Amino acid sequence: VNSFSGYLKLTDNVYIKNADIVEEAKKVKPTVVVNAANVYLKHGGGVAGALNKATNNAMQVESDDYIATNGPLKVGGSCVLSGHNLAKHCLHVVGPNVNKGEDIQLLKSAYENFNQHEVLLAPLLSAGIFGADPIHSLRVCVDTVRTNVYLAVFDKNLYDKLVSSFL
Ligand SMILES: Nc1ncn(Cc2cc(-c3ccco3)on2)c2ncnc1-2
């Protein structure tokens, strides 16, 4: 039994809700919140900009030190950093950005990072400003993630389309 509330159950392990991931993170304090990161951990907009804003820029400060030490992530890769005031940990996951020409096949690799964590609060990878079709992203999620994932979908109109079209 966990503290996530009001989710619709899509499969054995995938749940979905119309929610602001920032607000859901602050209420739940999940062990892991997933950030829709880029390889430079520059959290300027979309989910990443919102999560970082909610940390009063502490996420960005930590991320800049991470990059200075380790260099950029790979597209499809991830790193675990602090969750600050939002979660115990933040799993920064880089889905392919269609608006940069990155290969969509890397979306499966990106979701594989979730399998290293038993329970996660997450957005749909590569959705929003990353330019992929969120229906495709949901399908890859369901077909790749085996651990328990609670998906937050900010847009109510999109949430309803994802549910209604789910196979
Ligand atoms: N605070 C947040 N900001 C951004 N996203 C990503 C996102 C946005 C959309 C979309 C579709 C039409 C308009 O926006 O689809 N995915 C978030 N997901 C959960 N919380 C989020």
Short mmCIF file of C-alpha atoms and ligand atoms in Angstrom, two decimals:
data_model
loop_
_atom_site.label_atom_id
_atom_site.label_comp_id
_atom_site.label_asym_id
_atom_site.label_seq_id
_atom_site.Cartn_x
_atom_site.Cartn_y
_atom_site.Cartn_z
CA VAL A 1 0.00 0.00 0.00
CA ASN A 2 1.36 3.46 -0.97
CA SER A 3 0.12 7.03 -0.59
CA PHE A 4 -0.69 7.85 -4.28
CA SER A 5 -4.38 8.87 -4.56
CA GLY A 6 -6.97 9.25 -7.32
CA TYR A 7 -5.03 7.33 -9.97
CA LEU A 8 -6.64 5.29 -12.71
CA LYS A 9 -5.06 1.84 -13.04
CA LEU A 10 -3.99 1.14 -16.66
CA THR A 11 -2.11 -2.13 -16.09
CA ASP A 12 -0.71 -4.27 -13.30
CA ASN A 13 2.00 -1.65 -12.68
CA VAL A 14 1.09 1.62 -14.48
CA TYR A 15 -1.26 4.26 -13.05
CA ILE A 16 -2.27 7.67 -14.48
CA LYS A 17 -3.77 10.92 -13.21
CA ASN A 18 -4.51 14.42 -14.30
CA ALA A 19 -2.18 16.24 -11.93
CA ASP A 20 0.60 18.81 -11.68
CA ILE A 21 3.68 16.69 -10.93
CA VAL A 22 5.05 19.51 -8.74
CA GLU A 23 1.93 19.57 -6.57
CA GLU A 24 1.76 15.80 -6.53
CA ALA A 25 5.39 15.63 -5.55
CA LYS A 26 4.95 18.12 -2.70
CA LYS A 27 1.96 16.22 -1.29
CA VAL A 28 3.16 12.72 -1.73
CA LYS A 29 6.95 13.17 -1.02
CA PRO A 30 7.60 10.14 -3.14
CA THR A 31 10.85 8.24 -2.87
CA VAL A 32 11.54 9.05 -6.55
CA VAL A 33 10.26 11.84 -8.78
CA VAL A 34 11.32 11.66 -12.43
CA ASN A 35 12.49 14.81 -14.20
CA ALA A 36 12.16 15.22 -17.98
CA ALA A 37 15.80 16.25 -18.26
CA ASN A 38 18.11 17.19 -21.11
CA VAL A 39 21.72 16.02 -21.39
CA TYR A 40 23.05 19.28 -19.90
CA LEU A 41 20.63 19.23 -16.95
CA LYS A 42 19.58 22.77 -17.94
CA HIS A 43 16.12 22.88 -16.30
CA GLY A 44 14.67 25.78 -18.23
CA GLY A 45 11.10 24.85 -19.09
CA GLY A 46 8.51 22.14 -19.29
CA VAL A 47 8.48 19.69 -16.40
CA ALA A 48 12.15 20.40 -15.62
CA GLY A 49 11.67 24.13 -15.37
CA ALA A 50 8.65 23.62 -13.11
CA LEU A 51 10.39 21.12 -10.81
CA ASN A 52 13.48 23.30 -10.56
CA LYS A 53 11.42 26.42 -9.80
CA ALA A 54 9.71 24.57 -6.97
CA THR A 55 13.17 23.86 -5.45
CA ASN A 56 14.06 27.58 -5.51
CA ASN A 57 16.82 26.75 -8.08
CA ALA A 58 18.57 24.27 -5.76
CA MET A 59 18.04 21.54 -8.36
CA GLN A 60 19.89 23.65 -10.95
CA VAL A 61 22.78 24.42 -8.56
CA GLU A 62 23.20 20.71 -7.78
CA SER A 63 22.90 19.83 -11.47
CA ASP A 64 25.57 22.31 -12.53
CA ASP A 65 28.03 20.71 -10.10
CA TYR A 66 27.06 17.25 -11.43
CA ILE A 67 27.78 18.31 -15.04
CA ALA A 68 31.03 20.05 -14.13
CA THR A 69 32.25 16.77 -12.59
CA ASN A 70 30.75 14.17 -14.93
CA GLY A 71 29.92 15.84 -18.24
CA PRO A 72 26.60 15.52 -20.06
CA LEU A 73 24.24 12.60 -19.86
CA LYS A 74 23.43 10.41 -22.87
CA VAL A 75 20.10 10.67 -24.65
CA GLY A 76 18.24 7.70 -23.16
CA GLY A 77 20.32 7.92 -19.97
CA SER A 78 19.75 9.12 -16.43
CA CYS A 79 21.29 10.11 -13.14
CA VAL A 80 20.01 10.08 -9.55
CA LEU A 81 20.28 13.38 -7.68
CA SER A 82 18.54 14.89 -4.67
CA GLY A 83 14.78 15.33 -4.65
CA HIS A 84 15.20 18.51 -2.57
CA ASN A 85 11.85 19.55 -1.05
CA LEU A 86 9.87 17.46 -3.55
CA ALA A 87 10.98 13.83 -3.07
CA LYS A 88 13.78 11.81 -1.54
CA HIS A 89 15.49 11.46 -4.94
CA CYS A 90 15.08 12.90 -8.41
CA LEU A 91 15.76 10.55 -11.31
CA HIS A 92 16.77 12.85 -14.18
CA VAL A 93 15.89 10.93 -17.37
CA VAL A 94 16.72 12.15 -20.88
CA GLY A 95 14.11 11.17 -23.44
CA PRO A 96 14.79 12.00 -27.09
CA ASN A 97 13.80 15.52 -28.13
CA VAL A 98 12.05 15.37 -31.50
CA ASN A 99 12.54 19.17 -31.86
CA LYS A 100 16.33 18.37 -31.95
CA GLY A 101 16.05 15.37 -34.36
CA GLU A 102 16.85 12.60 -31.82
CA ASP A 103 15.88 9.04 -32.54
CA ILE A 104 12.53 8.07 -31.03
CA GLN A 105 13.76 4.48 -30.53
CA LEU A 106 15.77 5.96 -27.64
CA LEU A 107 12.47 6.47 -25.80
CA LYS A 108 12.47 2.79 -24.79
CA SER A 109 16.02 3.10 -23.44
CA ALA A 110 14.93 6.17 -21.47
CA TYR A 111 12.03 4.31 -19.83
CA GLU A 112 14.32 1.36 -18.94
CA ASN A 113 15.90 3.62 -16.32
CA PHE A 114 12.63 3.46 -14.37
CA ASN A 115 13.15 -0.29 -13.76
CA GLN A 116 15.97 0.51 -11.31
CA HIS A 117 13.37 1.96 -8.87
CA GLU A 118 10.51 0.05 -7.29
CA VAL A 119 8.05 3.01 -7.28
CA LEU A 120 8.20 6.34 -9.16
CA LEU A 121 6.16 9.48 -9.76
CA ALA A 122 6.83 10.42 -13.37
CA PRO A 123 5.79 12.47 -16.40
CA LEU A 124 5.43 10.96 -19.83
CA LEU A 125 8.93 10.97 -21.29
CA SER A 126 9.53 12.97 -24.46
CA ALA A 127 6.02 14.53 -24.21
CA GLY A 128 5.29 18.25 -23.98
CA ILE A 129 8.11 20.44 -25.29
CA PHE A 130 10.16 17.34 -26.18
CA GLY A 131 7.81 16.92 -29.15
CA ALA A 132 6.86 13.24 -29.12
CA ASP A 133 3.32 11.89 -29.33
CA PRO A 134 2.19 11.34 -25.70
CA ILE A 135 0.02 8.38 -26.76
CA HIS A 136 3.17 6.71 -28.14
CA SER A 137 5.09 7.63 -25.00
CA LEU A 138 2.40 6.00 -22.84
CA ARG A 139 2.52 2.84 -24.96
CA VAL A 140 6.32 2.60 -24.64
CA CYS A 141 6.00 3.20 -20.89
CA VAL A 142 3.50 0.38 -20.44
CA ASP A 143 5.55 -1.98 -22.61
CA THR A 144 8.91 -1.15 -20.95
CA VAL A 145 8.48 -0.25 -17.28
CA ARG A 146 7.92 -3.23 -14.97
CA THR A 147 8.16 -1.34 -11.66
CA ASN A 148 5.28 0.69 -10.24
CA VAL A 149 4.90 4.00 -12.06
CA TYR A 150 2.45 6.79 -11.25
CA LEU A 151 2.14 9.06 -14.22
CA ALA A 152 1.12 12.72 -13.81
CA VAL A 153 -0.38 14.38 -16.84
CA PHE A 154 -0.69 18.14 -16.44
CA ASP A 155 -3.17 18.76 -19.27
CA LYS A 156 -6.72 17.55 -18.55
CA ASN A 157 -7.61 17.38 -22.25
CA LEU A 158 -4.55 15.22 -22.92
CA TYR A 159 -5.22 13.03 -19.89
CA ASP A 160 -8.71 12.22 -21.17
CA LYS A 161 -7.40 11.41 -24.70
CA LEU A 162 -4.71 9.09 -23.27
CA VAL A 163 -7.30 7.19 -21.23
CA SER A 164 -9.91 6.97 -23.98
CA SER A 165 -7.41 5.70 -26.57
CA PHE A 166 -5.56 3.26 -24.28
CA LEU A 167 -5.44 -0.32 -25.52
N1 LIG B 1 4.22 20.88 -14.71
C1 LIG B 1 4.38 20.14 -15.93
N2 LIG B 1 4.88 20.73 -16.99
C2 LIG B 1 5.02 20.03 -18.14
N3 LIG B 1 4.63 18.74 -18.22
C3 LIG B 1 4.87 17.99 -19.43
C4 LIG B 1 3.78 17.87 -20.47
C5 LIG B 1 3.02 18.92 -20.94
C6 LIG B 1 2.19 18.40 -21.87
C7 LIG B 1 1.19 19.23 -22.63
C8 LIG B 1 0.33 18.81 -23.63
C9 LIG B 1 -0.35 19.94 -24.04
C10 LIG B 1 0.13 21.01 -23.31
O1 LIG B 1 1.06 20.55 -22.48
O2 LIG B 1 2.42 17.11 -21.99
N4 LIG B 1 3.42 16.75 -21.13
C11 LIG B 1 4.13 18.13 -17.12
N5 LIG B 1 3.69 16.86 -16.91
C12 LIG B 1 3.27 16.79 -15.64
N6 LIG B 1 3.44 17.98 -15.07
C13 LIG B 1 3.99 18.81 -15.99
#
